[PDB]
Structures are given as structure tokens and as C-alpha cells.
């Protein structure tokens, strides 16, 4: 049979949320994608032998806090926390995103993966060690990705799926 997973991708504008999602869904790199479009994308994949339907909310929009937005976000079973390794502000923003996740899920135990995107770029500003300690302090996996070269893209989403499965066992 099959299993469905609702994934939500969050992080600062321009970190590559849409590029990452389109790599997962369409298996190529799309370097210009309207920064204002928020939508959900599907894709069925086999992950550890199990047919997995991924429903991925690529976030955009305004920074508004309302019960409507909380309702969309609360539907997510797991979250990708995305920063760009060449943008320190996007990395500093991660703490805020995780807090809003914890708020709408009413739990500190929410499946999440920390994703340092743009690993293909030469002028890294966020050290891999800084990111690993942030993920360790959250108790979550960390992966560096490049939506440009597709490095780590599959594993980032599949690791999040594996984190959800565990959480569902409780
Ligand atoms: C680009 C800049 C354009 O405006 C855009 O597409 N954005 C920016 C606004 N969005 C947004 N931003 C933040 O954080 C911005 C930050 C970080 C520290 C706090 N502030 C002020 C300026 C920098 N946070 C957001 C949200 F938290 C949500 C949201 C709202 C309610 C509930 C939940 C629950 C879980 C997760 C999230 Cl993301 C929730 N929405 C937007 C938002 C939107 C977009 C960037 C993104 N993603
Ligand atoms: N070099 C490089 N550029 C990227 C990568 N991912 C996204 N980009 C670029 O970063 C910008 C923002 O990407 P986008 O997918 O729109 O980010 P979003 O706002 O988080 O949806 C665009 O110019 C993309 O071409 C990556 O892994 N490597
Ligand atoms: Mg986008």
C-alpha cells in the first residue's frame, strides 16, 4: 500500500526553498521561480521500500500571523528548516522558524531537518560546525544541499520522512 507525508519547507526568502522543492518534484534545477508563489507540490517516491506520497508546501507569502496561516502550517507533519550557507541572516532566522513551528504543533518534538543550501557556492559564511551544533541543540538531523547540483536534495526530504515515521510511532 502507501503512506502520505505532509512536508513544509520554511526559511528566509531566497534560501532556495522553491529550487529545492522543484528538484525533488521535477528532478532539475529551476533558477528563477516567482518568490511570491506559495503552493503545495506532490511526488510519489519509494523510501526504504515503502511507497511514499510526499505533499510539500513550499512557503512564501507575507509574514502574517493569523489563525488561517497557523491552520495551513499545522497540517505539516515535518518541516525542512532551510538556510543558505552564504547568508548568515538566513541562518540566524532558523531559531524563529522553529519556535513558530513548535507553537502551531504544540510540541517541542516536531520532525524537522536543518538544511544548509547552496553548498555548491565558494563563499560560505556559515560554518558547517556552527550548523551542526545548531541541529544538535535541537536534536535534529543536519544536511548540506545544493539545489543547483542536486547534492543532498533527495536525502534531505527522505531524512525528514524518516523523522516523521518515528514520531508517528509514539
Ligand atoms: C521576502 C523577504 C518576502 O517578504 C517573503 O516571501 N517572506 C518573508 C515574510 N515571511 C515570514 N518571515 C518570517 O520571519 C521573518 C523574520 C525572521 C525573524 C522574525 N522576523 C521579522 C523579519 C525577519 N516568519 C514567517 C512565519 F513564521 C510564517 C508563519 C506564520 C505563522 C505560523 C507559522 C508556523 C510555522 C512556520 C511558519 Cl513559517 C509560520 N510565515 C511567514 C514568515 C514569509 C516569507 C519567508 C518564508 N518562509
Ligand atoms: N548556487 C545556488 N543557487 C541557488 C541554490 N538554490 C537556490 N538558488 C538560487 O537562489 C535564489 C533563490 O532561490 P529560490 O528557489 O527562489 O528561493 P526561495 O525564496 O527560498 O523559494 C535563486 O536565484 C536561485 O537560483 C543552490 O543550491 N545553489
Ligand atoms: Mg520560493
Q: Alpha helix locations (H) across 33-87?
A: 67-74
Ligand 1 atom closest to the CA of 10, numbered from 1: 47
User: What residues are neighbours of ligand 3 (ion), with CB under 5 Å?
Assistant: 18, 60
Q: Alpha helix locations (H) across 3-127?
A: 17-26, 67-74, 88-92, 94-105
- Cα of first residue to Cα of last residue in the chain, in angstroms, is 21
Q: Which of 84, 82, 76 is nearest to 101 (CA)?
A: 76
CATH number at residue 36: 3.40.50.300
CA angle 35, 155, 113 (to 5 degrees): 65
Secondary element (H or E) of residue 6: strand 2-11
Domain that holds residue 136: 3-169
Nominal resolution (angstroms): 1.7
Number of domains in the chain: 1
State the burial class of residue 69 (Cβ atoms within 10 Å of its Cβ: 0-12, 13-18, 19+).
middle
Ligand 1 touching residue 81 (CB < 6 A): no
Looking from the CA of 112 toward its CB, the CA atoms found within 13 Å total 26
Report yes or no: 138 and 109 within 8 Å, Cβ to Cβ: no
Q: Which residues pair with 58 in a beta bridge?
A: 9, 39
Ligand 2 atom closest to the CA of 30, numbered from 1: 25
Q: Could you tell me the distance, in angstroms and rounded to a whole number, from the CA of residue 1 to the centre of ligand 2?
A: 35
Q: Which of 101, 110, 118 is nearest to 153 (CA)?
A: 118
Experimentally determined by = X-ray
Amino acid at each position: 500500500g502507501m503512506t502520505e507525508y505532509k512536508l513544509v519547507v520554511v526559511g528566509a526568502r531566497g534560501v532556495g526553498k522553491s529550487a529545492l522543492t522543484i528538484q525533488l518534484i521535477q528532478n532539475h534545477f529551476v533558477d528563477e521561480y516567482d518568490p511570491t508563489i506559495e503552493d503545495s507540490y506532490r511526488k510519489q517516491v519509494v523510501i526504504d521500500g515503502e511507497t511514499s506520497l510526499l505533499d510539500i508546501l513550499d512557503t512564501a507569502g507575507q509574514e502574517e500571523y493569523s489563525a488561517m496561516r497557523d491552520q495551513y502550517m499545522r497540517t505539516g507533519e515535518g518541516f525542512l528548516l532551510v538556510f543558505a550557507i552564504n547568508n548568515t541572516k538566513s541562518f540566524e532566522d532558523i531559531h524563529h522558524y522553529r519556535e513558530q513551528i513548535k507553537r502551531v504543533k504544540d510540541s517541542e518534538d516536531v520532525p524537522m531537518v536543518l538544511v544548509g543550501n547552496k553548498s555548491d557556492l565558494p563563499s560560505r559564511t556559515v560554518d558547517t560546525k556552527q550548523a551542526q551544533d545548531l541541529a544538535r541543540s535541537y536534536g535534529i538531523p543536519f544536511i548540506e544541499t545544493s539545489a543547483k547540483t542536486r547534492q543532498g536534495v533527495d536525502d534531505a526530504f527522505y531524512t525528514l520522512v524518516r523523522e516523521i515515521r518515528k514520531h508517528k510511532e509514539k
